[PDB]
Paper text:
While AMPylases from various pathogenic microorganisms have recently been characterized, the only virulence protein with de-AMPylation activity known to date is the Legionella pneumophila effector SidD which catalyzes AMP removal from the host GTPase Rab1. Here, we present the crystal structure of the de-adenylylation domain of SidD and reveal the catalytic mechanism of Rab1 de-adenylylation. Instead, the catalitic domain of SidD is remarkably similar to that of the metal-dependent protein phosphatases (PPMs), however with distinctive structural features to distinguish AMPylated Rab1 from similarly modified substrates. The finding that SidD is a PPM phosphatase with de-AMPylation activity constitutes a clear example of how L. pneumophila has adapted a common enzymatic fold and mechanism to effectively hydrolyze an unusual substrate.
We identified a proteolytically resistant N-terminal domain (residues 37–350; SidD-NT) that fell within the domain borders of the largest catalytically active domain discovered above and that crystallized readily. The structure of SidD-NT assumed an α/β fold formed by two stacked six-stranded antiparallel β-sheets flanked by α-helices. Pairwise alignment using the DALI server revealed a notable resemblance to metal-dependent protein phosphatases (PPMs), including human PP2Cα and the bacterial PstP which are considered the defining members of this family. In summary, the crystallographic structure of SidD-NT assumes a PPM fold with some conformational rearrangements and the presence of additional subdomains, most of them being grouped around the negatively charged active site. The active site of SidD-NT is located in a negatively charged cleft between the central β-sheets and comprises a relatively well-preserved binuclear metal center. The first metal (M1) is coordinated by four water molecules and residue D110, whereas the second metal (M2) is hexa-coordinated with the classical octahedral geometry formed by four water molecules, D110, and the main chain carbonyl of G111. The M1 position is slightly shifted as compared to other PPMs which can be attributed to the incomplete coordination derived from the absence of a highly conserved aspartic acid residue. Thus, in contrast to other bacterial PPM phosphatases, SidD appears to lack the capacity of binding a third ion at the equivalent M3 position. Quantitative Mg2+ analysis by inductively coupled plasma-optical emission spectrometry (ICP-OES) revealed a stoichiometry of Mg2+ relative to SidD of 1.7 to 1 (data not shown) suggesting that the active site of SidD contains two Mg2+ ions. The structure of the active site revealed the presence of two Mg2+ ions coordinated by D92, D110, D326, the main chain carboxyl of G111, and several water molecules.
Residue numbers in the entry: 37 to 84, 88 to 268, 277 to 350
The structure:
């Protein structure tokens, strides 16, 4: 392993939360929070499974930043999922960044990467069934860019230095399907790619990527809905109307989620009825580095 991992979270045990803290190596540019928003009450309004989510954030040996957001389907497979990401996905990231620099069409480079990941999964990790988005930075033409993709229900948003929030990877929903890295979706990888998210964008130091496995659904908006041959596909974005330009997006998302979750739990308790809703909740932050930090990380990777 030549990449530098500054934050990692392999699930969290039921009933617990995880807050990573900052890592001094990348000057507090990366953090993870992991918990569960699952609520299950009896009729008293009294409370009644571990997380399958994983986030990895770090830098290649070339100092390029990456974030990987993963959501495993099934609790009995979670170690197969977490091992697959370590053993097969992470070693691809450095060459992905180099191929984005070296080839003219980022869309072809990313489609090739997605095909490779399904092939490795088939050959080496049949029990790793999971949705995933990822992104990496790369340098071209004396500027910095970020490219990646998501298949399934994880998302990646970006808060730009000037304060604008944009979606890079949307949460995709397809009627009657759960598109994913799994045996079933591998039958038509190119159709799966076409209806999910691939992106390529210029970034500046201080732009802030926020990856997440889940948010309470009233906090998303529908960016686009379209039909495929007949199923409806929905692209769901974090709704920027809940945010402002001052604090980091990671800070504001945790605050807006926690306020919404206290409202949901209060409503659920007061109904005098069984209630069950919510899911595992894992959030990663990655601030795009400046050149000085990129150079420091390259040195650290060598020594
Ligand atoms: Cl590695
Ligand atoms: Cl660590
Ligand atoms: Cl913990
Ligand atoms: Cl399960
Ligand atoms: Cl392969
Ligand atoms: Cl093989
Ligand atoms: Cl095998
Ligand atoms: Cl496996
Ligand atoms: Cl480009
Ligand atoms: Cl397969
Ligand atoms: Cl296909
Ligand atoms: Cl909505
Ligand atoms: Cl810079
Ligand atoms: Mg899920
Ligand atoms: Mg899951």
């Amino acid at each position: 392993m030549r990449s530098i991992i500054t934050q990692i979270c392999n699930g969290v045990l039921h009933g617990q939360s995880y807050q990573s803290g900052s890592n001094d190596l990348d000057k507090g540019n990366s953090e993870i929070f992991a918990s569960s928003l699952f609520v299950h009450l009896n009729e008293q309004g009294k409370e009644i499974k571990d997380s399958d989510d994983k986030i990895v954030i770090g830098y290649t040996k070339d100092g390029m930043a990456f974030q990987i957001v993963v959501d495993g389907f099934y609790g009995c497979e979670r170690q197969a999922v977490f091992s697959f990401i370590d053993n097969y996905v992470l070693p691809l990231i450095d060459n992905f960044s180099l191929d984005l620099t070296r080839y003219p069409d980022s869309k072809k480079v990313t489609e090739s990467l997605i095909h490779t990941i399904y092939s490795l999964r088939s050959k080496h990790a049949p029990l790793a069934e999971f949705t995933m988005s990822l992104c990496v930075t790369y340098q071209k033409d004396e500027q910095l860019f970020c490219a990646g993709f998501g298949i399934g229900d994880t998302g990646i948003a970006i808060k730009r230095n000037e304060g604008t929030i944009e979606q890079l990877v949307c949460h995709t929903e397809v009627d009657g399907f759960k598109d994913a890295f799994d045996n079933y979706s591998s039958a038509n990888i190119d159709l799966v790619i076409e209806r999910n998210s691939v992106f390529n964008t210029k970034v500046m130091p201080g732009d802030e990527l926020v990856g997440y496995t889940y948010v309470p659904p009233m906090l998303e908006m529908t960016e686009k809905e379209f039909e495929v041959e007949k199923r409806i596909v929905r692209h769901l974005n974090l709704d920027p109307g809940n945010f402002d330009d001052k604090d980091p997006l990671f800070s504001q998302l945790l605050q807006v989620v926690k306020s919404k979750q206290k409202q949901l739990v209060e409503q659920a308790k007061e109904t005098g009825q069984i209630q069950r809703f919510g899911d595992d909740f894992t959030v990663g932050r990655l601030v795009i580095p400046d050149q000085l930090l990129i150079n420091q990380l390259r040195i650290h990777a060598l020594s």
